Amino acid sequence: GPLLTSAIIFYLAIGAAIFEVLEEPHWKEAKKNYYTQKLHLLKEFPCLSQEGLDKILQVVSDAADQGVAITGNQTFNNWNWPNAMIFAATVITTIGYGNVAPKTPAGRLFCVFYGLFGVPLCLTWISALGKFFGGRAKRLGQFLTRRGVSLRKAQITCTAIFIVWGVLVHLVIPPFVFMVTEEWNYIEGLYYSFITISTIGFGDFVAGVNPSANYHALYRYFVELWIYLGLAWLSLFVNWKVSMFVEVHKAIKKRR
Amino acid sequence: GPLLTSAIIFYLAIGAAIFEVLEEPHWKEAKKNYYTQKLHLLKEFPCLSQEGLDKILQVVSDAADQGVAITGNQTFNNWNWPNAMIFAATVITTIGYGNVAPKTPAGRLFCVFYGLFGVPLCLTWISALGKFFGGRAKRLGQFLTRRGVSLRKAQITCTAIFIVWGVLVHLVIPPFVFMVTEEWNYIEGLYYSFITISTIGFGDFVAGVNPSANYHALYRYFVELWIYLGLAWLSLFVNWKVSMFVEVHKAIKKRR
Ligand SMILES: [K+]
Ligand SMILES: [K+]
Ligand SMILES: [K+]
């Protein structure tokens, strides 16, 4: 499509405008609140002049630069054996959340090598896993529909059931799980589920990382298994690009 | 098959071990240094009590959640027109830097659907322009090599030249450009280059977002264009998956 790039440009433009009108006033009022609360904090202690608060902000911005927390009790220990097991998984999945990242040059270069040698490995593993699940699921579905009441287009209904299963278990139900275990309303839950599935990983919402919470010994592992199952399920429709694309576009000639 | 998953488990285990032994010591030193700097800020300021520092830290962490900068002069305006355009560009690329993200429930709910409708669109567009570039490069290389001496391996030489060209232009050379314009030592530039090429996007390093730096008027657009071309070259190799995979491993059967 020679007009596909024009579509891209128009889409980028309108999305930028909507994001502007939606978020910019919030950012302005947030900055204004930050400024007035800084001023109020200065009024709380005139003995601490503006420069003292500047130095405080500098120490804070450098602590946040070295990974440690800001609020207090920065004893989460993101870099121990059970947790680095999880950070390694979000690297080889191209999620790259952003709440934790290497800070040492040796560590940075090792992370480069680890990604370079693992991302292809992890992607092939996930592709094979998803292909195996898809094959076995189609086999069992066909065996049930043929031994039972046979259908003319059972394959269409089968893939419909499969896609609704995926969308239900990965974008609708997890918001309710995280509502009770992570204290997120449905909007944040859906937002985090989608950010994770697409391997976008903004990292502003990460499950199983909250110092003021109680988690089971194998909770983060359950979350990681959920993430990997999501990526595996997605791999099928990633591979069905042209097949499903023409399958759905064959009827578009009637609609347009 | 089932042995591959064992490879994955051992890979994750050793990666977690090395990542621990690398960052965990420096993370502990960072935490202790933050603690000691806190104690120094406390002792140097008598009127600033422990609870006062707690309140300041909480207010900073609260504003830092909204996206504002902690340092000062947060006049970057990540949500003006061009910055929103570039953010939209990163979102639909599965990069998700995660240094900026929508903080409004309406904004998050809109970003979910924006991703849903753009990520497949942008992936298709990148794949199309990549196949275009690859076909043009292939026909040009063949027209050049058929004039002079040719061979069956000639196409293999063309593939090798294209591989090394991509490696140089997107992985090895950019660190020098960013040493010039961003003042990153080579390891930082290489780390950032790889992270953005593999669509990990940790967001610790982003090219073109610095309040104190003085960038050109088209700097960010050029960076984004280079990113798009890099991901196009990446997709070209992605679609070259199994052509080289099964061709070479069978050649070693005759070697023994
Ligand atoms: K990604
Ligand atoms: K990311
Ligand atoms: K990502």
Coordinates of C-alpha atoms and ligand atoms in Angstrom, one line a residue:
Chain A
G1 CA 0.0 0.0 0.0
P2 CA 1.6 3.3 -1.2
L3 CA -0.9 5.1 1.1
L4 CA 0.0 2.9 4.1
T5 CA 2.6 5.4 5.2
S6 CA 0.2 8.3 4.8
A7 CA -2.2 6.3 7.1
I8 CA 0.7 5.9 9.6
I9 CA 1.4 9.7 9.5
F10 CA -2.3 10.6 9.9
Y11 CA -2.6 8.1 12.8
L12 CA 0.5 9.4 14.5
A13 CA -0.8 13.0 14.1
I14 CA -4.3 12.4 15.5
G15 CA -2.9 10.3 18.4
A16 CA -0.4 12.9 19.3
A17 CA -3.2 15.5 19.3
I18 CA -5.5 13.4 21.5
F19 CA -2.6 12.5 23.9
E20 CA -1.9 16.3 24.1
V21 CA -5.4 17.4 24.9
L22 CA -5.8 14.5 27.3
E23 CA -2.6 14.5 29.3
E24 CA -1.0 17.9 29.0
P25 CA -3.3 19.7 31.4
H26 CA -2.8 17.0 33.9
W27 CA 1.0 17.4 33.6
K28 CA 0.7 21.2 33.9
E29 CA -1.4 20.9 37.1
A30 CA 1.0 18.3 38.5
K31 CA 4.0 20.5 37.9
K32 CA 2.1 23.4 39.5
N33 CA 1.3 21.3 42.5
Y34 CA 4.9 20.2 42.8
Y35 CA 6.0 23.8 42.7
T36 CA 3.6 25.1 45.3
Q37 CA 4.3 22.1 47.6
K38 CA 8.0 22.8 47.2
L39 CA 7.3 26.4 48.2
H40 CA 5.2 25.3 51.2
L41 CA 7.9 22.9 52.3
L42 CA 10.3 25.8 52.2
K43 CA 7.9 27.8 54.4
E44 CA 7.8 24.9 56.8
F45 CA 11.4 25.5 57.7
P46 CA 12.9 28.9 56.8
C47 CA 16.2 27.6 58.2
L48 CA 16.3 25.3 55.2
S49 CA 16.6 27.8 52.3
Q50 CA 15.9 27.0 48.7
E51 CA 19.4 25.7 48.2
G52 CA 19.1 23.1 50.9
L53 CA 16.0 21.7 49.2
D54 CA 17.9 21.8 46.0
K55 CA 20.6 19.6 47.5
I56 CA 17.9 17.3 48.9
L57 CA 16.4 16.9 45.5
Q58 CA 19.8 16.2 44.0
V59 CA 20.5 13.4 46.5
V60 CA 17.0 12.0 45.8
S61 CA 17.6 12.1 42.0
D62 CA 20.9 10.4 42.4
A63 CA 19.5 7.7 44.7
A64 CA 16.8 7.0 42.1
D65 CA 19.7 7.0 39.6
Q66 CA 21.3 4.1 41.5
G67 CA 18.1 2.0 41.7
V68 CA 17.3 2.4 45.4
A69 CA 13.9 3.6 46.4
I70 CA 12.8 7.0 47.5
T71 CA 10.0 6.7 50.0
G72 CA 11.5 4.5 52.7
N73 CA 12.5 1.0 53.8
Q74 CA 14.3 0.3 50.5
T75 CA 14.8 -3.3 51.5
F76 CA 13.0 -4.9 48.6
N77 CA 16.4 -6.4 47.4
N78 CA 15.5 -6.5 43.7
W79 CA 18.9 -8.2 43.0
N80 CA 18.7 -11.4 45.1
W81 CA 18.4 -14.9 43.7
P82 CA 14.6 -15.2 43.6
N83 CA 14.1 -11.7 42.2
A84 CA 17.0 -11.6 39.6
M85 CA 15.4 -14.8 38.4
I86 CA 12.4 -12.6 37.4
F87 CA 14.3 -9.6 36.1
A88 CA 16.2 -12.0 33.7
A89 CA 12.8 -13.1 32.4
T90 CA 11.6 -9.6 31.5
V91 CA 14.8 -9.0 29.6
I92 CA 14.6 -12.0 27.3
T93 CA 11.0 -11.3 26.6
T94 CA 11.6 -7.7 25.2
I95 CA 9.4 -6.4 28.0
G96 CA 12.1 -4.4 29.8
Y97 CA 9.8 -2.9 32.4
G98 CA 12.0 -0.1 33.6
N99 CA 11.6 -0.2 37.4
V100 CA 14.9 -2.1 37.6
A101 CA 17.9 -2.0 35.2
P102 CA 21.6 -2.5 35.4
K103 CA 23.6 0.5 36.8
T104 CA 27.2 -0.8 36.5
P105 CA 29.3 -0.7 33.3
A106 CA 30.3 -4.3 33.6
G107 CA 26.7 -5.2 34.5
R108 CA 25.5 -3.1 31.5
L109 CA 27.8 -4.9 29.1
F110 CA 26.8 -8.3 30.5
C111 CA 23.2 -7.3 30.1
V112 CA 23.9 -6.5 26.5
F113 CA 25.4 -9.9 26.0
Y114 CA 22.7 -11.7 27.9
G115 CA 20.0 -10.0 25.9
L116 CA 21.8 -10.6 22.6
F117 CA 22.2 -14.4 23.4
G118 CA 18.9 -14.9 25.2
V119 CA 16.1 -13.0 23.4
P120 CA 16.3 -15.2 20.3
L121 CA 16.4 -18.3 22.5
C122 CA 13.4 -17.2 24.5
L123 CA 11.5 -16.1 21.4
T124 CA 12.0 -19.5 19.8
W125 CA 11.1 -21.3 23.0
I126 CA 7.9 -19.3 23.3
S127 CA 7.0 -19.9 19.7
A128 CA 7.5 -23.6 20.0
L129 CA 5.4 -23.7 23.2
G130 CA 2.6 -21.8 21.7
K131 CA 2.6 -23.9 18.6
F132 CA 2.4 -27.1 20.7
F133 CA -0.5 -25.7 22.7
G134 CA -2.3 -24.6 19.5
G135 CA -1.8 -28.0 17.9
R136 CA -3.0 -30.0 20.9
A137 CA -6.0 -27.6 21.5
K138 CA -7.1 -27.8 17.8
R139 CA -6.7 -31.6 18.0
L140 CA -8.9 -31.9 21.1
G141 CA -11.4 -29.5 19.8
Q142 CA -11.8 -31.3 16.5
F143 CA -12.0 -34.6 18.3
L144 CA -14.9 -33.3 20.5
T145 CA -16.8 -31.6 17.7
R146 CA -16.5 -34.5 15.3
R147 CA -17.2 -37.3 17.7
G148 CA -20.0 -35.1 19.0
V149 CA -22.4 -33.1 16.8
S150 CA -20.3 -32.2 13.7
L151 CA -20.3 -28.7 12.3
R152 CA -19.8 -27.3 8.8
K153 CA -17.4 -24.5 10.0
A154 CA -16.3 -25.9 13.4
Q155 CA -12.8 -24.5 12.7
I156 CA -14.2 -21.0 12.6
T157 CA -16.1 -21.4 15.8
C158 CA -13.0 -23.2 17.3
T159 CA -10.7 -20.3 16.6
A160 CA -13.4 -17.9 17.8
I161 CA -13.6 -19.8 21.1
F162 CA -9.8 -19.8 21.3
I163 CA -9.5 -16.0 20.8
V164 CA -12.3 -15.2 23.3
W165 CA -10.6 -17.6 25.8
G166 CA -7.3 -15.7 25.3
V167 CA -8.9 -12.2 25.5
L168 CA -10.9 -13.2 28.6
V169 CA -8.1 -14.8 30.6
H170 CA -5.5 -12.2 29.7
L171 CA -7.4 -8.8 29.6
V172 CA -10.6 -9.1 31.6
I173 CA -10.1 -11.6 34.5
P174 CA -6.5 -10.5 35.6
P175 CA -7.9 -7.1 36.5
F176 CA -10.0 -8.8 39.2
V177 CA -7.1 -10.9 40.5
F178 CA -4.9 -7.8 40.9
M179 CA -7.7 -5.9 42.5
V180 CA -7.5 -8.0 45.7
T181 CA -3.8 -8.8 45.6
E182 CA -2.4 -5.5 44.3
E183 CA -5.2 -3.1 45.1
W184 CA -5.6 -1.7 41.6
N185 CA -9.0 -0.7 40.2
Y186 CA -10.1 -2.2 36.9
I187 CA -8.7 0.6 34.8
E188 CA -5.1 0.1 36.1
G189 CA -5.5 -3.6 35.9
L190 CA -6.6 -3.6 32.3
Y191 CA -3.9 -1.1 31.5
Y192 CA -1.1 -3.2 33.1
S193 CA -2.4 -6.4 31.5
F194 CA -2.2 -4.9 28.0
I195 CA 1.1 -3.1 28.6
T196 CA 2.5 -6.5 29.6
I197 CA 1.0 -8.6 26.8
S198 CA 2.2 -6.4 24.0
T199 CA 5.7 -6.5 25.5
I200 CA 5.6 -2.7 25.8
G201 CA 6.5 -2.7 29.5
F202 CA 6.3 0.9 30.6
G203 CA 7.2 -0.5 34.0
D204 CA 5.0 1.9 35.9
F205 CA 2.9 -1.0 37.0
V206 CA 4.7 -4.2 37.9
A207 CA 3.2 -7.1 39.7
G208 CA 4.8 -8.7 42.7
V209 CA 7.0 -5.7 43.6
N210 CA 5.5 -3.9 46.5
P211 CA 7.5 -3.6 49.8
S212 CA 4.4 -2.8 51.9
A213 CA 2.5 -6.0 50.9
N214 CA 2.4 -9.7 51.7
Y215 CA 2.9 -12.2 48.9
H216 CA 3.1 -16.0 48.8
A217 CA 6.5 -17.6 48.4
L218 CA 5.8 -18.5 44.8
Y219 CA 3.6 -15.5 43.8
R220 CA 6.0 -13.8 41.5
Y221 CA 6.6 -17.1 39.7
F222 CA 2.8 -17.5 39.2
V223 CA 2.8 -14.0 37.7
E224 CA 5.7 -14.9 35.4
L225 CA 4.0 -18.1 34.3
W226 CA 0.9 -16.0 33.5
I227 CA 3.0 -13.6 31.5
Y228 CA 4.7 -16.4 29.5
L229 CA 1.4 -18.1 28.8
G230 CA 0.2 -14.7 27.5
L231 CA 3.1 -14.4 25.2
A232 CA 2.8 -18.0 24.0
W233 CA -0.9 -17.6 23.2
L234 CA -0.1 -14.4 21.4
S235 CA 2.5 -16.1 19.3
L236 CA -0.2 -18.1 17.4
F237 CA -2.0 -15.0 16.1
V238 CA 1.4 -13.4 15.5
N239 CA 2.1 -16.3 13.1
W240 CA -1.4 -16.4 11.6
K241 CA -0.8 -13.0 10.1
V242 CA -1.5 -13.6 6.4
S243 CA -3.8 -16.6 7.0
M244 CA -6.2 -14.9 9.4
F245 CA -5.8 -11.6 7.5
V246 CA -7.1 -13.0 4.2
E247 CA -9.6 -15.1 6.2
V248 CA -11.2 -12.0 7.5
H249 CA -10.6 -9.8 4.5
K250 CA -12.4 -12.2 2.1
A251 CA -15.7 -10.9 3.5
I252 CA -14.6 -7.2 3.5
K253 CA -15.1 -7.2 -0.3
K254 CA -18.8 -7.5 0.4
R255 CA -18.8 -4.9 3.2
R256 CA -16.8 -2.4 1.0
Chain B
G1 CA 12.0 -30.2 22.4
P2 CA 11.7 -31.0 26.1
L3 CA 15.4 -30.6 26.4
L4 CA 15.1 -27.0 25.2
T5 CA 13.1 -26.0 28.3
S6 CA 16.0 -27.3 30.5
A7 CA 18.3 -25.1 28.5
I8 CA 16.0 -22.2 29.3
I9 CA 15.9 -23.0 33.0
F10 CA 19.6 -23.3 33.3
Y11 CA 20.1 -20.1 31.3
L12 CA 17.8 -18.2 33.6
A13 CA 19.5 -19.7 36.6
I14 CA 23.1 -18.7 35.6
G15 CA 21.9 -15.3 34.4
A16 CA 20.3 -14.6 37.7
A17 CA 23.5 -15.8 39.5
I18 CA 25.7 -13.5 37.4
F19 CA 23.3 -10.6 37.7
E20 CA 23.2 -11.0 41.4
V21 CA 27.0 -11.1 41.8
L22 CA 27.3 -8.1 39.6
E23 CA 24.7 -5.7 40.7
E24 CA 23.7 -6.9 44.3
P25 CA 27.1 -5.6 45.7
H26 CA 26.8 -2.3 44.0
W27 CA 23.1 -2.1 44.9
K28 CA 24.0 -2.6 48.6
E29 CA 26.7 0.1 48.3
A30 CA 24.2 2.4 46.7
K31 CA 21.6 1.8 49.5
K32 CA 24.2 2.3 52.2
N33 CA 25.5 5.5 50.5
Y34 CA 21.9 6.8 50.3
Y35 CA 21.5 5.9 54.0
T36 CA 24.7 7.7 55.0
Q37 CA 23.8 10.8 52.9
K38 CA 20.4 10.8 54.6
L39 CA 22.1 10.8 58.0
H40 CA 24.4 13.6 56.9
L41 CA 21.5 15.7 55.6
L42 CA 19.8 15.1 58.9
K43 CA 22.7 16.0 61.2
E44 CA 23.7 19.1 59.1
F45 CA 20.1 20.4 59.6
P46 CA 18.8 20.5 63.2
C47 CA 15.4 22.0 62.5
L48 CA 14.9 19.4 59.7
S49 CA 13.8 16.5 61.7
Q50 CA 13.4 12.8 60.7
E51 CA 9.7 13.2 60.1
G52 CA 10.4 16.4 58.0
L53 CA 12.8 14.4 55.7
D54 CA 10.1 11.7 55.5
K55 CA 7.5 14.3 54.4
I56 CA 9.9 15.8 51.8
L57 CA 10.8 12.4 50.4
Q58 CA 7.1 11.4 50.3
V59 CA 6.2 14.6 48.4
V60 CA 9.0 14.1 45.9
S61 CA 8.1 10.5 45.3
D62 CA 4.5 11.6 44.9
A63 CA 5.3 14.2 42.3
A64 CA 7.9 11.9 40.6
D65 CA 5.0 9.5 40.1
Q66 CA 3.2 12.1 38.1
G67 CA 6.0 12.5 35.6
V68 CA 7.6 15.8 36.7
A69 CA 11.4 16.0 37.0
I70 CA 12.9 16.1 40.5
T71 CA 16.1 18.0 39.5
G72 CA 14.6 21.4 38.5
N73 CA 13.5 23.4 35.4
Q74 CA 11.1 20.7 34.3
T75 CA 10.3 22.7 31.2
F76 CA 10.8 19.8 28.8
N77 CA 7.0 19.5 28.3
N78 CA 6.9 15.8 27.3
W79 CA 3.3 16.4 26.4
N80 CA 3.6 19.2 23.8
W81 CA 2.9 18.5 20.2
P82 CA 6.2 17.0 18.9
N83 CA 7.0 15.2 22.2
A84 CA 3.6 13.6 22.1
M85 CA 4.3 12.6 18.5
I86 CA 7.5 10.9 19.5
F87 CA 5.9 9.2 22.5
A88 CA 3.2 7.9 20.2
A89 CA 6.0 6.7 17.9
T90 CA 7.6 4.7 20.7
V91 CA 4.3 3.2 22.0
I92 CA 3.4 1.6 18.6
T93 CA 6.9 0.2 18.3
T94 CA 6.6 -2.0 21.4
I95 CA 9.6 -0.1 22.7
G96 CA 7.8 1.5 25.7
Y97 CA 10.7 3.4 27.1
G98 CA 8.8 4.0 30.3
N99 CA 10.4 7.2 31.2
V100 CA 7.0 8.9 30.4
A101 CA 3.6 7.2 30.6
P102 CA 0.0 8.4 30.8
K103 CA -1.1 9.1 34.4
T104 CA -4.8 9.9 33.8
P105 CA -7.4 7.1 33.8
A106 CA -8.9 8.4 30.6
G107 CA -5.3 8.6 29.3
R108 CA -4.6 5.0 30.2
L109 CA -7.9 3.7 28.8
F110 CA -7.2 5.5 25.6
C111 CA -3.6 4.2 25.4
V112 CA -4.8 0.7 25.7
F113 CA -6.9 1.0 22.5
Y114 CA -4.2 3.1 20.8
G115 CA -1.8 0.3 21.3
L116 CA -4.3 -2.3 20.2
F117 CA -5.0 -0.5 17.0
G118 CA -1.5 0.8 16.3
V119 CA 1.0 -1.9 17.2
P120 CA -0.3 -4.3 14.5
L121 CA -0.5 -1.4 12.1
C122 CA 3.0 -0.1 12.8
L123 CA 4.4 -3.7 12.7
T124 CA 2.8 -4.2 9.2
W125 CA 4.1 -0.9 8.0
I126 CA 7.7 -1.6 9.2
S127 CA 7.6 -5.0 7.7
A128 CA 6.4 -3.6 4.3
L129 CA 9.0 -0.9 4.1
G130 CA 11.6 -3.4 5.2
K131 CA 10.8 -5.8 2.4
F132 CA 10.9 -2.9 0.0
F133 CA 14.4 -1.9 1.2
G134 CA 15.5 -5.5 1.1
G135 CA 14.3 -6.1 -2.4
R136 CA 15.9 -2.9 -3.7
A137 CA 19.2 -3.8 -1.9
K138 CA 19.1 -7.4 -3.3
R139 CA 18.5 -6.3 -6.9
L140 CA 21.2 -3.6 -6.7
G141 CA 23.7 -6.0 -5.2
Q142 CA 22.9 -8.6 -7.8
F143 CA 23.1 -6.1 -10.7
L144 CA 26.6 -5.1 -9.4
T145 CA 27.9 -8.6 -8.8
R146 CA 26.8 -10.0 -12.2
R147 CA 28.7 -7.3 -14.1
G148 CA 31.9 -8.5 -12.4
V149 CA 32.9 -11.9 -11.2
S150 CA 30.0 -14.0 -9.9
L151 CA 29.5 -17.2 -8.0
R152 CA 26.9 -19.1 -6.1
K153 CA 28.4 -17.8 -2.8
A154 CA 28.0 -14.2 -4.3
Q155 CA 24.6 -13.9 -2.6
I156 CA 26.1 -15.1 0.6
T157 CA 28.7 -12.3 0.4
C158 CA 25.8 -9.9 -0.2
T159 CA 24.0 -11.2 2.9
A160 CA 27.3 -10.9 4.9
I161 CA 27.9 -7.3 3.8
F162 CA 24.3 -6.4 4.7
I163 CA 24.6 -8.0 8.1
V164 CA 27.8 -6.1 8.9
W165 CA 26.3 -2.9 7.5
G166 CA 23.4 -3.2 9.9
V167 CA 25.6 -4.1 12.8
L168 CA 27.8 -1.1 12.2
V169 CA 25.1 1.5 11.5
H170 CA 22.8 0.5 14.4
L171 CA 25.0 -1.1 17.0
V172 CA 28.7 0.0 16.8
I173 CA 28.8 3.5 15.2
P174 CA 25.8 5.2 17.0
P175 CA 27.7 5.2 20.3
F176 CA 30.2 7.7 18.8
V177 CA 27.4 10.0 17.5
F178 CA 25.9 10.0 21.0
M179 CA 29.3 10.6 22.5
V180 CA 29.4 13.7 20.4
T181 CA 25.9 15.0 21.0
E182 CA 24.8 13.3 24.2
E183 CA 28.1 12.9 26.1
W184 CA 27.7 9.1 26.8
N185 CA 30.8 7.0 27.2
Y186 CA 30.9 4.2 24.7
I187 CA 29.4 1.5 26.9
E188 CA 26.3 3.6 27.6
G189 CA 25.9 4.4 23.9
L190 CA 26.2 0.7 23.0
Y191 CA 23.9 -0.4 25.8
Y192 CA 21.2 2.2 24.7
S193 CA 21.6 1.2 21.0
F194 CA 21.1 -2.5 21.7
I195 CA 18.2 -1.9 24.1
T196 CA 16.4 0.2 21.6
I197 CA 17.1 -2.2 18.7
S198 CA 15.8 -5.2 20.6
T199 CA 12.6 -3.3 21.6
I200 CA 13.4 -3.7 25.3
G201 CA 13.4 0.0 26.0
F202 CA 14.3 0.2 29.7
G203 CA 14.1 4.0 29.5
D204 CA 17.1 4.7 31.6
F205 CA 18.7 6.1 28.4
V206 CA 16.7 8.1 25.9
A207 CA 18.2 10.1 23.1
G208 CA 16.8 13.7 22.8
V209 CA 15.2 14.3 26.2
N210 CA 17.4 16.5 28.4
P211 CA 16.4 19.9 29.8
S212 CA 20.0 21.1 30.1
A213 CA 21.2 19.9 26.7
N214 CA 20.8 22.1 23.7
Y215 CA 19.6 19.9 20.8
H216 CA 19.1 20.8 17.2
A217 CA 15.6 21.5 15.9
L218 CA 15.3 18.1 14.1
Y219 CA 17.4 16.0 16.5
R220 CA 14.5 13.9 17.9
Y221 CA 13.0 13.3 14.4
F222 CA 16.3 12.1 13.1
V223 CA 16.7 9.8 16.1
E224 CA 13.2 8.4 15.4
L225 CA 13.9 7.9 11.7
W226 CA 17.1 6.0 12.5
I227 CA 15.2 3.9 15.0
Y228 CA 12.6 3.0 12.4
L229 CA 15.2 2.1 9.8
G230 CA 17.0 0.0 12.4
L231 CA 13.8 -1.9 13.2
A232 CA 13.2 -2.4 9.5
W233 CA 16.6 -3.9 9.0
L234 CA 15.8 -6.1 12.0
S235 CA 12.6 -7.3 10.5
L236 CA 14.4 -8.2 7.3
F237 CA 16.5 -10.6 9.3
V238 CA 13.4 -11.7 11.2
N239 CA 11.9 -12.9 7.9
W240 CA 15.2 -14.6 7.1
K241 CA 14.6 -17.0 9.9
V242 CA 14.8 -20.6 8.7
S243 CA 16.5 -20.1 5.3
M244 CA 19.9 -20.2 7.0
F245 CA 18.9 -22.2 10.0
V246 CA 18.3 -25.6 8.4
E247 CA 20.7 -25.1 5.5
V248 CA 23.9 -25.0 7.6
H249 CA 23.3 -27.5 10.4
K250 CA 22.9 -30.3 7.9
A251 CA 26.2 -29.4 6.2
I252 CA 28.1 -30.6 9.3
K253 CA 26.6 -34.1 8.9
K254 CA 29.0 -34.7 6.0
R255 CA 32.0 -33.3 8.0
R256 CA 31.9 -36.4 10.1
Ligands
K1 K 9.0 -5.4 22.8
K2 K 9.9 -1.4 27.8
K3 K 9.5 -3.2 25.6

